[PDB]
Amino acid sequence: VSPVVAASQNSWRCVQSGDREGWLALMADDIVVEDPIGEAVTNPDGTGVRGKAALAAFYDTNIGPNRLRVTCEATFPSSSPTEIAYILVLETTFPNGFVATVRGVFTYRVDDAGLITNLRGYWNMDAMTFT
């Protein structure tokens, strides 16, 4: 199993099961989560959430309260064991039974210690759907 695949799918298990430290422990000190890339509801800034500091906050705002579901439709490994792309569908159910769903390309990168330095989502609000 490649390091980027172990890390990336340990991330999916951690966000799906409320394992905040599990999740944070997978992440390098220089982590840059851009879900998605560019300015949006969850990237207000437009330049992503930086360091374990701001990502802890990001979790407690957008993930810790809710039920997040990751579904993998396709894997696109590269020729490097530290970088992969996927087609995921993300599905956040809020406590009021409100459900936001989005399909996108998600790229990952780990450093030489095996920790995520970059999580990057290719999607916009035009693609998100509500139920």
If one asks whether residue 129 binds its own copies (CB under 8 A), the answer comes out as no
Rule CB under 8 A: say whether 66 interacts with its own copies.
no
Contact by Cβ (8 Å): 90, 69: yes
- Distance, in Å, from the CA atom of 38 to the CA atom of 124, rounded to the nearest integer, reads 9
Q: Take residue 122 and report the two structure tokens written for it.
A: 């290719």
Residue 3 as a binder of its own copies (CB under 8 A): the answer is no
Among 83, 91, 101, 111, binds its own copies (CB under 8 A): 83
Count of residues engaged in binding its own copies, rule: CB under 8 A: 26
User: Residue 110 corresponds to which amino acid?
Assistant: V
Q: How many CA atoms lie within 13 A of 89 on its CB side?
A: 7
Question: Among 25, 45, 65, 77, which residue interacts with its own copies (rule: CB under 8 A)?
Answer: 77
Q: Yes or no: say if 105 and 122 are a contact pair by the CB < 8 Å rule.
A: yes
User: Which residues are CB-contacts of 106 (< 8 A; sequence separation ≥ 6)?
Assistant: 85, 86, 87, 88, 119, 120, 121, 122
CB of 66 to its own copies, least distance (A): 19
Interaction residues for its own copies, span 26-55 (CB under 8 A): 36-40, 43, 46
Kindly report the length of the chain: 131
Whose Cβ is closer to its own copies: residue 44's or residue 95's?
A: 44
Residue 107 as a binder of its own copies (CB under 8 A): the answer is: yes
CB of 130 to its own copies, least distance (A): 17
Q: Where on the chain is the footprint of its own copies (CB under 8 A)?
A: 36-40, 43, 46, 76-85, 104-105, 107, 121-126
